[PDB]
DNA sequence: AGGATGTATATATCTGACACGTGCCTGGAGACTAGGGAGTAATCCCCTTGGCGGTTAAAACGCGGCGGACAGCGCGTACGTGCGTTTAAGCGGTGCTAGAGCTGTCTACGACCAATTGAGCGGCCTCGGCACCGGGATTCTCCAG
DNA sequence: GAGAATCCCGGTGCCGAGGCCGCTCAATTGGTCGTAGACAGCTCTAGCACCGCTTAAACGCACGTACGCGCTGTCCGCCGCGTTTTAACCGCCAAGGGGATTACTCCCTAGTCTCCAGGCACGTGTCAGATATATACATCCTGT
């Protein structure tokens, strides 16, 4: 057997995923989530395809930005992990209550 | 009647001048539009488009390809210092993120 | 006839600034929305600048001030110049 | 209950694209909450725009306008 | 050395309005004659610009620089021409005012005069 | 109102300079402030550190460690103008002590590319301390904003081609209109000799 | 001193003059190579029309600059 | 020789300044600052009396709003004081 | 026909003023290096506002910055002001 | 006689002035007849709400007027008006009082 | 001859709170408030009438504009008040 | 410092997306006329810059001592890495009604012009609510037991 | 249990809110005219519900190694208070640039026929880029 020590494969993942462009979250569960949320404001709604694609793109952008801000906040306090307090602080400075 | 010479040719432009006129008159921006505003608008728009498409092709020829896909426009936009503050609230589709790893995570 | 686009006019500028490159299909959509955004912003600013001073038209000076307001740094001092050139080639014909 | 379709590895991949290196164990629930709120707002505005014009199909321009009303322009469509 | 809100010291206010005994006292008491303001002017500059000859004489007689520059790199001769005077030009030229220095716009002092005798030199 | 600053002294030498200043009872400085009107350089040749270059550009003395030894021995106030590093960082003081313009008074610069041997912020600070200005886009030699500039550049030679053409592209045909192209070596040499050497 | 002139069709013509001439002479030199008569040409430089009767150096033109040429027919 | 202990006068000043409405930036220096920058942009300007007051109000509200989030970031790291690193994290997360 | 100028005036916004602003913010203990940072931020903000104000003024062929111009500038940036 | 338009709709805010401002402000080619009779009511309701909540806090401090401090106190305590006016600065107002829970004495 | 809604605010205040008054530095705030809300609502209604290839700015546009801009609870009260006013007006 | 896993090069081949071509229908161009918005001169008077001076509230300089920030070392549990097992995403088919677009008539609603009259704006003017000032009361903190 | 600081209670003075008057300019009534928006009606692009399968990705368990979090010392940086030196704030007088209105004459733009070239939907074809392959070589660890 031969192992890498902790903290090495993570850097490889960082380098890989920051160079591609494919979509990350799967495609069918997102469709079902959107339909189940929107099924409380009307009754017989129908969706095109560009609609779910656009929603997915915007959601991914939002979450990636949030995680960048959280990481900066975490490093600011002499740590390397991230925890819920960081998400709360980032979102409260931004102005989203 | 003499031979027709279009308005986009007298100014030495490539964007249209009839279309900009028509869209400025039937969009309810004012009650009457002068006869010199469309040329100004066309010139400015053409300059911006040229400025972005010149910077896209450099990053295109870097990675040894002969087309322009959205990743290249994202790179060219996010890597300049003035074209960033103008488009600082837009998100390109099928784009990506710039490479940056913090310096207190390396071995 | 049907919906009109700005796609026959980006290709010409491309062939003029870079003579050995093409452009894909989705990139054309990006470049086709980028023009509408800027158009609407500039027109909307010129309208209000005409409404404050009690005037009733849109002339070249309104566009000049609208451009100088909402373009940052050294992108103004260039664009303005270009614009002026066009008008001077127009009145002299 | 369909919020469980956003699994654990998906959140890990988004985090990696962010730039993080070590994730904790109680970070997933908060992510799901934030996502739910965002989607709720956008979808409600879109359905209002759609119901106005007497239609029954949410199209792409509706979502584009809904995102534009908050500062998320989203060129591309 | 309590300066004003514009940069002017006491010698500046003394020079901008001819008060020769006051300047004599101020100089004999001790005051450096080469101190620029926030724009870049010097006492000799204003002295030659407004048109008092005796103050320029007194300032020159105490080792003040003769080709110092200021706003947009204008020499004393530049103002002495651009306004129009007779005596100060003769005095300065006798003292060694450079007649070939140039300003930021690329012009010479001869290009800023109207009089025939003025253009003669 | 003498001040002090160091540009390569030793730790024991640093303590020695501290004690000498205390004997002189003057304010010291670690970060480069504006009023730093004295610089002590270890060796006997103008080095290529950022601090020494900023010192020669702002204008002040560049003295050697022999003056430190002499001040330690004689224990008196000072004796200047005997150990100044000569031949090139001397015309700067003579230019600043006669009310003349700065070096790059009327030039425009643009940086572009990848800089490895030297960083970027350092060069930007050097330019903005010299007297010029920095640009943000590439100066194409066919646009109106480049042709409509009338600013002769002082400090050039008597009658040459570096008097009407005052824009530069710097990286890490040589004159197309009013725009040049030059490597970083020419810049960093131009600073440490106080003269716009041609081409 | 060489000088470039540019025409709306996208061409470049080169000329050689001295810095004490008059616009009429430049128009004559242009007609000596183009063919258009010297009564229908108008020149543009730095966003302003040029009149006939002044010297070149008055408008601050130096070596290796560019002028634009426009006709008056249509 | 009576003497308070460090920490009590600050709370009192907090309670006092949070219950009063008045400008606290010494008008005439502020006027000179605005005129200096204006001199930078154009030549030979002159200001009304209301422009300076409007600018004063806006530029005080901005700084108060910044200092609140600075204090939050500082508390987040098990400290009581504010240093010149918190301001930068605040301005970075905000988007300026 | 000369011209005078003003310089080095950011030092009138002294130390106790920054302290009073911080008190109204909610802080309790202040370090000894926040002052330069505060001054820098203030200068940047004021420049960005006065530029647009002067542009509006110069459009209408006037020479005095009025009260409505600052309001229009601040609404352009993103922060409105009620009262004038 | 002449029954005015704002008094046959039950309102107190005007109805003709709004018509003129909608017709000569470049918002569309034509403005319908039932367009202002809605805007007037909406504006009136919002103003009544704000003014009532301001007068309350004005009374709770032993005074009989309304100065800007009271409007500032009545806006930042509503949890539904704080969202509509979030990027607004009231002149000559102030800030709400709250000290954090850590900096208090033991 | 300038214009200002400085007389109607008085009537609403006199009918909600009988014995009170308004200082002069507090009427300008109400003026600016009314103007800003007017501009927001009318602008959104205009954009919504243009995104459908139509030319009249009718009442449904204002309904949808109110339902988009104002937050949750205030919307229901606002819509009810407007509807009551309009139906009373058209009844007579 | 070999041994073992990734990542980069180099070369086959192969399918589907880009660049060019040709009828032809709707929107841009040349030539003319009728009316009102904006460019240009004069002239009245409100309000911004520049000085002078006495008085007292804030800014600048210094000192002795305590609470907090930054660097050490010592435990114990929560998260990173490689495996073998079980769930359901993605691809490619085919049948199908519901709802988005287009077209052709025909009528109820808003721009437009004229004549007559009450609501809302500018200025005067006088009494009550708030700002400013001295005096006992009561709450809150620190050294000492 | 004492010191300093904050809250009530009268008490005099002073200017800005709350009414009031003529009159001028926009809102109301009473008409006609040319054209958007409601409402039937027929054609056909695209979205929802199914089925089988091949294989990439989500679940579940084990072991051991950094990293989070709670202690205990050492000492330089910042708060609180009293004396001295600087320039803001207030009230007052004088001179001249530029913001607000008012008129008169002319040049620039909306509104209408007419005819000729620039741009859109539809076809058909050849080359740049995505995939499978062997392997050449550039980091990462554990042993000594």
Numbering used by the authors:
A (entry chain Cb): 39 to 135
B (entry chain Ab): 12 to 118
C (entry chain Bb): 33 to 125
D (entry chain Da): 25 to 101
E (entry chain Ea): 418 to 538
F (entry chain Eb): 565 to 736, 745 to 771
G (entry chain Fa): 1 to 74
H (entry chain Ca): 39 to 134
From the paper:
To address how a fully assembled larger fragment of BRCA1–BARD1 complex interacts with its substrates, we determined the structure of cat BRCA1Δ11:BARD1 bound to H2AKc15ub nucleosomes. We obtained a map at a global resolution of 3.4 Å with clear density for the coin-shaped nucleosome core particle, thus allowing de novo model building of the histone octamer and unambiguous fitting of the core nucleosome DNA sequence. There was poorer density for the 15 bp DNA linker arms, suggesting these are flexible and not tethered or stabilised by the BRCA1Δ11:BARD1 complex. Interestingly, on one face of the nucleosome we observed well-ordered density for the covalently H2A-linked ubiquitin and extra density attributable to the BARD1 ARD-BRCTs. This minimal nucleosome-interacting module was arranged in a similar manner as the analogous BARD1ARD-BRCTs-nucleosome structures recently determined after glutaraldehyde chemical crosslinking. Interestingly, the ARD-BRCTs region is at an overall lower resolution compared to the core nucleosome particle, and multiple different conformations with varying degrees of engagement with the nucleosome surface were visible, suggesting the ARD-BRCTs modules display a degree of flexibility. Surprisingly, we could not visualise significant additional density on the opposite face of the nucleosome despite extensive processing, where we would have expected the BRCA1–BARD1 RING domains to bind in the ‘clamp’ model. At this interface we could only identify diffuse density localised over the H2A N-terminal tail, which is consistent with unbound H2AKc15ub as observed previously.
